[PDB]
Amino acid sequence: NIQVVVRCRPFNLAERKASAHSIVECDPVRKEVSVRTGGLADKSSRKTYTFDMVFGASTKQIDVYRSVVCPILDEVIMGYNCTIFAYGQTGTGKTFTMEGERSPNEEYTWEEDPLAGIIPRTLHQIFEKLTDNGTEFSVKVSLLEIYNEELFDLLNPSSDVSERLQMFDDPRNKRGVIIKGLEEITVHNKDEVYQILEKGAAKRTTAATLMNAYSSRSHSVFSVTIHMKETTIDGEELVKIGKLNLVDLAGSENNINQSLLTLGRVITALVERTPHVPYRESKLTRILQDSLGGRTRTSIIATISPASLNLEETLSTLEYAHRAKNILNK
Ligand SMILES: Nc1ncnc2c1ncn2[C@@H]1O[C@H](COP(=O)(O)OP(=O)(O)O)[C@@H](O)[C@H]1O
Numbered sequence: 193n194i195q196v197v198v199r200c201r202p203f204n205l206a207e208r209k210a211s212a213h214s215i216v217e218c219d220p221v222r223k224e225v226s227v228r229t230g231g232l233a234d235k236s237s238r239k240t241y242t243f244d245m246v247f248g249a250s251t252k253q254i255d256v257y258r259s260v261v262c263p264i265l266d267e268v269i270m271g272y273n274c275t276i277f278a279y280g281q282t283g284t285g286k287t288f289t290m291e292g293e294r295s296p297n298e299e300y301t302w303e304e305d306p307l308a309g310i311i312p313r314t315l316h317q318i319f320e321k322l323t324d325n326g327t328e329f330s331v332k333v334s335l336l337e338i339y340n341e342e343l344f345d346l347l348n349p350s351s352d353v354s355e356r357l358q359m360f361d362d363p364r365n366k367r368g369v370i371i372k373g374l375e376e377i378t379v380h381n382k383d384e385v386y387q388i389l390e391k392g393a394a395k396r397t398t399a400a401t402l403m404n405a406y407s408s409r410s411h412s413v414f415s416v417t418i419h420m421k422e423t424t425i426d427g428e429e430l431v432k433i434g435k436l437n438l439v440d441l442a443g444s445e446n447n448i449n450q451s452l453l454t455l456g457r458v459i460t461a462l463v464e465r466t467p468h469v470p471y472r473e474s475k476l477t478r479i480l481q482d483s484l485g486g487r488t489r490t491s492i493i494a495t496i497s498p499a500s501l502n503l504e505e506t507l508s509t510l511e512y513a514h515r516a517k518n519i520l521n522k
C-alpha cells in the first residue's frame with residue numbers, strides 16, 4: 193500500500209570534470225533501478241530493485257510533480273490526509289526534491305523557476321486549483337523540525353530557534369499529539385507564499401549556526417492544511433479538510449538520531465507484522481504515526497547518488513526503501 197519511488201540525481205560538475213562512471217541505471221518503464229556492485233562496465237555483478245516508480249538523473253522537477261505530487265494533492269483536496277517522505281544519504285537530493293532551489297542570476301520568478309521543488313509548487317497549485325472552481329478555502333502552513341529529539345518552530349517570527357517546543361499526547365483523538373506553541377501561518381493568497389518560505393530559510397540559517405550539522409541531522413515536517421467549503425454549480429456545499437505533510441528526513445548515512453533509528457524500527461515491525469510498533473520511542477514517529485500504518489496515504493521518495501563512492505549507502509537506501517513497500521495503511 194505505501195508507495196515508494198526512487199530518484200537518482202545526476203553527476204555534479206566536480207564529477208563531470210573527473211569523468212565519473214555511473215554505477216546506477218534506471219528503467220522507468222519497468223519500475224526498476226540497477227546497481228553495479230562488483231565493478232567493471234565490461235563485466236560485472238549487479239543488484240536490481242523494483243519500486244512503484246523510478247526517476248533517473250534526467251528527471252526534472254516538473255516530472256516529479258506531475259507524476260507523484262499532482263495525484264496526491266487531488267486526494268488532499270478531497271478531504272484526505274497525505275504524507276510524502278524524502279529518504280536518502282546526505283547530498284542525494286532530499287531537499288532539492290522537497291523544496292527545490294532558485295535558478296541563478298534572478299532568471300525566473302519563484303512561480304516559474306524550473307528548479308522549484310514539491311513545496312513551492314504545491315502551494316502555488318492549491319491557489320491555482322481552488323481559486324478557479326467555486327470553492328471557499330483557507331490555507332495554513334506549519335514547519336516543525338526535530339533536532340536531537342527537540343522540537344523547533346521554523347516559521348514563528350517572534351521566537352528564536354533556541355526555544356524548543358513541548359509535545360503531549362492528545363487526550364481527544366488517540367495516537368495523535370499536541371505541539372504546544374506550534375505556529376500555523378495562514379497563507380491568504382499565492383503572492384504570500386514565497387516570503388513565508390523565505391522566512392523559514394532565514395530562521396533555519398540561525399538554527400544551523402546554533403546546532404552542529406543541522407541540515408544533515410534534523411527532520412523537517414512542512415505541513416499544509418486546507419479548510420474547504422465547496423459549492424457545486426447546483427447548490428451543494430461540501431465541507432472538506434485536507435492535510436499534506438512534506439517530510440525531509442535526516443540524512444540516512446552512518447552521535448545518534450533517535451527519530452531516524454525509530455523510523456526504521458517502526459517500519460520493520462509494520463512489515464514483519466509484529467504486534468508492538470515502537471511509535472513512541474521518538475518524536476518523529478509519534479508525530480507522524482498515522483502516516484505509518486495508519487489512515488493516511490503516504491509515499492516515500494528515496495534519493496540516491498550514481499557515483500561509485502556512495503555504493504554502500506546507495507544499497508542501504510534502496511534496500512530500506514524496498515522493505516517499506518510492504519507497509520499497509522488505512
Ligand atoms: N535532481 C537533481 N538535479 C540537479 N541537481 C540536483 C538534483 N538533486 C540534487 N541535486 C544537487 O545535489 C546537491 C545535493 O543537494 P541536496 O538536495 O541538498 O541533498 P540532501 O538534501 O539529500 O542532503 C545540490 O547541490 C543540488 O543542487
Ligand SMILES: CN(C)C(=O)N1CC(c2cc(F)ccc2F)=C[C@H]1c1ccccc1
Pocket residue numbers: 290291292293294302303305307308309311312335389390391392393396414
Ligand atoms: C532561496 N530559496 C531557494 C528559497 O527561498 N526557497 C525556500 C524554500 C523552502 C524553505 C523552507 F523553509 C521550507 C520549505 C521550502 F520549500 C524552497 C525555495 C524555493 C525554490 C524555488 C521556488 C520557490 C521557493
Ligand SMILES: [Mg+2]
Pocket residue numbers: 286287407408
Ligand atoms: Mg538537506
